[PDB]
Amino acid sequence: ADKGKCGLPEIFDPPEELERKVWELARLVWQSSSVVFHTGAGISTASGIPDFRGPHGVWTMEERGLAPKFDTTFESARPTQTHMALVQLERVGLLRFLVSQNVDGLHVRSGFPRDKLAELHGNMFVEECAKCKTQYVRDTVVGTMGLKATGRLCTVACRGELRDTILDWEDSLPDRDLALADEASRNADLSITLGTSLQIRPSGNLPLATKRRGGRLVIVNLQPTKHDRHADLRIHGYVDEVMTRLMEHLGLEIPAWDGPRVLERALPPLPRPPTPK
Numbered sequence: 091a092d093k094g095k096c097g098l099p100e101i102f103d104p105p106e107e108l109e110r111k112v113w114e115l116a117r118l119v120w121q122s123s124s125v126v127f128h129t130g131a132g133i134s135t136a137s138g139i140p141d142f143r144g145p146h147g148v149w150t151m152e153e154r155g156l157a158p159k160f161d162t163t164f165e166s167a168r169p170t171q172t173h174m175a176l177v178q179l180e181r182v183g184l185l186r187f188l189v190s191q192n193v194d195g196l197h198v199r200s201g202f203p204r205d206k207l208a209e210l211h212g213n214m215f216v217e218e219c220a221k222c223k224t225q226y227v228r229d230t231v232v233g234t235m236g237l238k239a240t241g242r243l244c245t246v247a248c249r250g251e252l253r254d255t256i257l258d259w260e261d262s263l264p265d266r267d268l269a270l271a272d273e274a275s276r277n278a279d280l281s282i283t284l285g286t287s288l289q290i291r292p293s294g295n296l297p298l299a300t301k302r303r304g305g306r307l308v309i310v311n312l313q314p315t316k317h318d319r320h321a322d323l324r325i326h327g328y329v330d331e332v333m334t335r336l337m338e339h340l341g342l343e344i345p346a347w348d349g350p351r352v353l354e355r356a357l358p359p360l361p362r363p364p365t366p367k
């Protein structure tokens with residue numbers, strides 16, 4: 091396949107411009123009915139997992155004849171302030187759906203409901219049965235990549251071959267996840283992209299489905315993105331700093347993470363502060 095544009099220069103918004111943009115983002119969240127978030131490799135860099143096309147990204151370092159650096163294992167990695175902010179946003183009903191390109195499995199481990207999440211490129215902790223399609227969320231990473239047999243069998247008897255959910259460059263996106271991600275993105279009046287370069291299709295094109303129906307588009311990234319020209323608001327800064335300032339404006343606290351936990355279905359929305367005039 092193609093690695094795309096790697097190691098592009100990073101842009102940083104000054105403290106004055108950044109503060110005004112987070113308030114503009116807060117206004118867009120309060121006024122929107124269907125908010126869909128789009129996450130990429132950048133929202134995991136603050137946890138010790140490198141991105142792909144950033145200054146020290148996997149494909150950027152490969153081009154330089156160097157190896158990417160991991161400051162953690164996927165099992166010892168803890169969800170960032172951004173992952174936990176997204177958990178709270180969903181809990182208070184301010185987040186309708188979450189579309190992710192990340193294989194790190196941090197969204198599931200943070201306690202985010204799996205029925206409001208589309209894992210387009212898979213999850214390295216999730217293995218699927220080839221016969222009944224039943225998914226298994228493991229506490230450790232699945233040893234195989236490229237939808238290959240792991241060795242373990244189904245327990246629902248079915249006894250079907252369990253395969254990884256990691257897609258190779260040539261593999262097609264999962265039908266259920268892509269259909270739900272496309273439906274949510276199309277029907278959203280606000281799509282916010284966090285830590286994604288938006289260079290890989292159809293994943294990168296999903297936030298544009300919002301823009302096609304008069305819906306608003308917000309892009310939060312350090313480097314420039316493929317669809318920068320069609321964003322209503324472009325925030326250049328660290329996703330953790332942007333989300334921390336956002337939660338403060340919304341009057342929401344970032345919840346504590348008490349270790350890896352799996353939530354299959356979303357609960358009814360928890361009480362949230364009243365909306366400003």
Ligand SMILES: CC(=O)N[C@@H]1[C@H](O)[C@@H](COP(=O)(O)OP(=O)(O)OC[C@H]2O[C@@H](n3cnc4c(N)ncnc43)[C@H](O)[C@@H]2O)O[C@H]1O
Nearest residue numbers: 130131132135141142143191285286287311312313328329
């Ligand atoms: C293997 C596979 O099947 N698919 C992978 C991956 O799933 C897919 C998606 O790419 P993405 O998720 O956008 O990573 P990025 O291109 O490196 O884009 C990440 C973006 O995050 C930005 N970024 C990094 N840290 C950030 C931070 N703390 N705050 C804000 N932005 C950040 C960075 O500038 C980069 O532009 O590309 C494929 O190689």
Ligand SMILES: [Zn+2]
Nearest residue numbers: 219222244248
């Ligand atoms: Zn099975």
